[PDB]
Amino acid sequence: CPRFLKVKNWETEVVLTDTLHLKSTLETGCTEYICMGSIMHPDVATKDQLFPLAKEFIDQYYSSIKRFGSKAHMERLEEVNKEIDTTSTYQLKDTELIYGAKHAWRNASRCVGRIQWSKLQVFDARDCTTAHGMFNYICNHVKYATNKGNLRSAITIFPQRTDGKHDFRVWNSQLIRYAGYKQPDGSTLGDPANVQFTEICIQQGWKPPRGRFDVLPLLLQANGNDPELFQIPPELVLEVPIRHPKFEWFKDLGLKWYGLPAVSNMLLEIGGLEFSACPFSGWYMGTEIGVRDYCDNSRYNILEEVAKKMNLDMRKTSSLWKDQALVEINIAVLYSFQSDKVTIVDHHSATESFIKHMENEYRCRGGCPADWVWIVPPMSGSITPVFHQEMLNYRLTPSFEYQPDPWNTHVWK
Amino acid sequence: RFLKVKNWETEVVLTDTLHLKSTLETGCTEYICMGSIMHPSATKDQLFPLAKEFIDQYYSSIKRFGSKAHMERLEEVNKEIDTTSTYQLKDTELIYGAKHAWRNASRCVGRIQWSKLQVFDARDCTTAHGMFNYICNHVKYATNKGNLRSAITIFPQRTDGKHDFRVWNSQLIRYAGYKQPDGSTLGDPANVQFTEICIQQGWKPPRGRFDVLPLLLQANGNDPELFQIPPELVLEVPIRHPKFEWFKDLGLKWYGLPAVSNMLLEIGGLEFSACPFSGWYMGTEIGVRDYCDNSRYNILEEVAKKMNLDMRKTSSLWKDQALVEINIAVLYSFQSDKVTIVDHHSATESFIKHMENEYRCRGGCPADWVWIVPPMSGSITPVFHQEMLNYRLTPSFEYQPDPWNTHVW
Ligand code: HEM
Ligand code: HEM
Ligand SMILES: Cc1cc(N)nc(CCc2cc(CCCN(C)C)cc(C(F)(F)F)c2)c1
Ligand SMILES: Cc1cc(N)nc(CCc2cc(CCCN(C)C)cc(C(F)(F)F)c2)c1
Ligand SMILES: C[C@H](O)[C@H](O)[C@H]1CNc2nc(N)[nH]c(=O)c2N1
Ligand SMILES: C[C@H](O)[C@H](O)[C@H]1CNc2nc(N)[nH]c(=O)c2N1
Ligand SMILES: [Zn+2]
């Protein structure tokens, strides 16, 4: 590969030079003949697979603290090598775990919020042994991150994978989500995205309220055991009722959403170690709720109901009634969160901050992998600065990865 | 391998076999994706295999592969490359090649129309006056009093690279842009440079906001020449809004005919450095990009003011509001004037339908998600949720350098 790749911003003419791509470790899925950039998704490490992965990471950590080649560096390398040799794995030091998590975020090409990457509270839950313990750790995480509406980004890291039959998993895809219920008539109550998981919960013993916004229980797997159900204490779940600054009828739609976005189904990979349970949370960009959660056809799908209330002509698509309603919905979301003092960021501010971040990273780090398809917001793309920004996408490690859904793999005891 | 693309809204899965037919590179590697880079990255010996490949797929498409006509054509092209260092396409081949360049254009959301393309053969042209005549005929045919019709005019192919035909304008119809003493820009900033070249070559600029530029036409490698397109051929739409009666007072207009004139058509090794082609607008091209890009007409503030919007915080989404109203005005104006235009909802729906057709009858459809998804309201259009595979098939339209960075006078 060429040593220097250039990216241009077509609005500012600013040109940046990427050297960081040379540290790329995993594959994108693209080839020289085909690009898979819009594709959503394109038994453990053996001793020999693990050695060079650990060393690569340890080298990187010690390079970051400006102690590369030091005695402490050679010693740590030696101790890790010993541990892999005699146990087929190793344990990260707390300092290394913290560095790794922060860098997994820093390296997450799909995330527009990375300007905040170095402010991440890391909760070390590697001593956890049971589902009840996992629940305690998750409650503490939710309460800390929620902070009464002044959200703080955080991750909780449960024990790494060993042989693959003792995995810790949060079965939920997010810590906080609403239930979806398929009706006999084929309609759906609640959030259609969560129907499958909701059914699993009901089968596991959950008694569902069968409402539009029922917070799902946590379904927690510790040490490869069958997963267990827990109800998040409702006082720990911050929610925001959605109203509009101009339209007084908006609150009559009875919408609300939860304050804390917390992904709980990804795998954190550090130095060849695999943490299959690492729920992390930040705060929302408005469009995630206002465009995707509310206006996607396969989600709450409210555009029509809002358009009717707006008295829009909905006979021709060229009236742009969908676009008009979409903006008002997103206005309402931003206004409801700001009024209730729950942290949220609009897509203009988030994308402008991301460009600033990206430029700093090109300066200090030699690049910043970014997935344009994901970085550009789902509405009003070209009036945000990221639309005009060329981006190089590549996979650095440590990283957050996708993993199969646990019910597809779990060996029921 | 066979590749699957999923639509995450409909759960429809399609299988791509067509990508196996490509030979040209995308720029990505196994480790770096360049999907959002705008521009990533003959001889007798290079020429014949490219000719062969092209002749072969032409004859495979009329179901006469390995026929006498096919055999003779391969022989005929062989002889001609050997004797003359190039070859000439039959008319049937020229038409097939141009339609297929469009069909293969991964960045075009308009391809459901690909096989309805009026092809004008201008390969007998020798002078800039000849070019002007061909271009005027194109513009008149394609404009059709508002009932727009897709067309392409093809001028002589490249020979030695010293005798190129080029249309210097980036589009056939575009508005001039002027640098002001006060540092700002009058008209369209995208064309400031081109405008200065016209002025420097003798164009007398009216210095308005929407002055149609002259054509600058280069024939057979010679210095380009200026021509004014007869005004009765230039269809324009005054932009007004269906509810905001103050909108027409913004003095906005645009032309009806989008006609890209700066691209290179490649067919079977032959390069056509002048092939202006035209269709009709998708509304967002004008209403979002031309009017609202910071580096273009940049009218959001002005509109937002007239709507009395709170402009202090970005979180009031005042920009988004102004953007939607502008695009409503553009659609309404073109529709009221009976000038062909498509909204991004209709155009993207048609593209999904087109993708389904292509997968069925052709085994795939190369598409660039970065370009196909509209510059506003992305995820409320079906293409946002549509996985797409991007790859390069030939014949194709390609970028080429601006003529003024290469031309010696
Ligand atoms: C602090 C405020 C944050 C904001 C505003 C933010 C914003 C976003 C947005 C808008 C997306 C795309 C979401 C989607 O459309 O599904 C995203 C994705 C992502 N974020 Fe961030 N994020 C934040 C915090 C975090 C944190 C704390 C982490 C990890 C420590 C993180 C890691 C990721 C990852 C891995 C993705 C890709 C998710 C996927 O592929 O499904 N983000 N972020
Ligand atoms: C007939 C109706 C048509 C519609 C609605 C349409 C729509 C579009 C749009 C929206 C784009 C993206 C434009 C941009 O963002 O700059 C585009 C690009 C493109 N179109 Fe189409 N188009 C049409 C006709 C045609 C025709 C007739 C041809 C050629 C024969 C063509 C070939 C191309 C090519 C090569 C591009 C890529 C331009 C570039 O890479 O800069 N299109 N089209
Ligand atoms: C930490 C964090 C902060 C932030 N602002 N956003 C995120 C992304 C979370 C997210 C997940 C998901 C996945 C849910 C649906 N599948 C399970 C089917 C969706 C969204 C959404 F829809 F974009 F808002 C957002 C994560
Ligand atoms: C044939 C055709 C039909 C159609 N509807 N659209 C096109 C693309 C035309 C087009 C060109 C260009 C290039 C001019 C700007 N640069 C010089 C900075 C831009 C756009 C737009 F508006 F940005 F989408 C659209 C071509
Ligand atoms: C098909 C396409 O890749 C898919 O719909 C992507 C597009 N861009 C996205 N961008 C974000 N932020 N989130 C998403 O879920 C998606 N979905
Ligand atoms: C950097 C990025 O590739 C560039 O801004 C692209 C994004 N998508 C686009 N999409 C279309 N249709 N037209 C464009 O000019 C662009 N510009
Ligand atoms: Zn790629």
From Swiss-Prot, chain A:
(6R)-L-erythro-5,6,7,8-tetrahydrobiopterin binds at residues 38, 373-374, 387. It comes from the Eukaryota. Heme b binds at residues 111, 402. It is found in: Cell membrane, Sarcolemma; Cell projection, Dendritic spine. Isoform 1 is ubiquitously expressed: detected in skeletal muscle and brain, also in testis, lung and kidney, and at low levels in heart, adrenal gland and retina. Not detected in the platelets. Isoform 3 is expressed only in testis. Isoform 4 is detected in testis, skeletal muscle, lung, and kidney, at low levels in the brain, but not in the heart and adrenal gland. L-arginine binds at residues 174, 283-284, 288. Ubiquitinated; mediated by STUB1/CHIP in the presence of Hsp70 and Hsp40 (in vitro). The PDZ domain participates in protein-protein interaction, and is responsible for targeting nNos to synaptic membranes. Mediates interaction with VAC14. Belongs to the NOS family. Homodimer. Interacts with DLG4; the interaction possibly being prevented by the association between NOS1 and CAPON. Forms a ternary complex with CAPON and RASD1. Forms a ternary complex with CAPON and SYN1. Interacts with ZDHHC23. Interacts with NOSIP; which may impair its synaptic location. Interacts with HTR4. Interacts with SLC6A4. Interacts with VAC14. Interacts (via N-terminal domain) with DLG4 (via N-terminal tandem pair of PDZ domains). Interacts with SLC6A4. Produces nitric oxide (NO) which is a messenger molecule with diverse functions throughout the body. In the brain and peripheral nervous system, NO displays many properties of a neurotransmitter. Probably has nitrosylase activity and mediates cysteine S-nitrosylation of cytoplasmic target proteins such SRR. This is Nitric oxide synthase 1. It comes from Homo sapiens (Human). The gene is NOS1. The chain holds residues 302 to 722 of 1434 of the full protein.
